[PDB]
Design a protein around this ligand. Structure first.
Ligand SMILES: NC[C@H](O)c1ccc(F)cc1
Ligand SMILES: [Cl-]
Ligand SMILES: [Cl-]
Ligand SMILES: [Cl-]
Ligand SMILES: [Cl-]
Ligand SMILES: [Mg+2]
Lengths: 137, 140
């Protein structure tokens, strides 16, 4: 672990916890999230992101908790990283648009939702993005 | 790297939150980074761009400079990841997608590269960038 702290590497890189156990921890983090146990979900998603900062779903989980907690800028920061780590997935850009509206930045929000509609292949996501655009003055 | 610093900062105030370095000094450091870069001092330029990306990671100009350095150094995955951050932050052109396409071709991912270059041709209003993208598509 110390070596990974000094070399900047992840705990996942050194197989510090077996993979099936990490799956279980992610499932439990999601259970806490779905049950509204936000404090515990936050601990578990922070734990996961320490373990593997390059895991898009771990990042997205922590970003979602920050958004629920109305830490909108912190959520938007993580969503930008999640977009870069993902597989052509514009869901983090969609949630960034929601964060920008809550930050009273509607032109930034519009740009996010427009990006989703122009580049995403996720039809359900684009429908949602369009509904936000429909509402944005 | 820069991305791990961004994530650690979010997991765990930061220097940016306290305005620890004023905008005019950051502008100067950015200029100094390109001076090193332009002279072939790419290791020093990398340090300066890493410094900028520690202070203000969500700045497209800092991210694009560092991504270019990684691409020149043939750290293609790191470059691609940073280019994508610049796009998500709203970089006002498709050059991050174009250069990601180049990175993906060097990573032996020609289908990912094709999607990048097709996105450029479909959406860029830069006619010269579109010809460059089309030339890659012709070869893939
Ligand atoms: N297939 C293109 C991919 O979604 C993508 C790669 C890089 C980028 F800057 C934006 C988008
Ligand atoms: Cl915040
Ligand atoms: Cl929200
Ligand atoms: Cl705005
Ligand atoms: Cl462009
Ligand atoms: Mg920050």
């Amino acid at each position: 672990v110390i070596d990974a702290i000094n070399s900047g590497a992840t705990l996942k890189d050194i197989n510090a916890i077996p993979d099936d156990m990490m799956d279980d921890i992610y499932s439990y983090a999601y259970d806490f999230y779905n049950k509204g146990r936000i404090e515990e979900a936050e601990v578990f998603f922070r734990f996961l992101c320490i373990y593997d900062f390059y895991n898009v779903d771990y990042i997205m989980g922590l970003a979602a908790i920050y958004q629920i907690k109305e830490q909108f800028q912190q959520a938007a920061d993580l969503y930008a990283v999640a977009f870069a780590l993902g597989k052509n997935d514009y869901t983090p850009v969609f949630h960034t648009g929601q964060c920008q509206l809550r930050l009273k930045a509607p032109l930034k929000a519009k740009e996010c939702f427009e990006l989703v509609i122009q580049h995403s292949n996720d039809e359900k996501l684009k429908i949602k993005a369009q509904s936000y655009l429909d509402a944005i003055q």
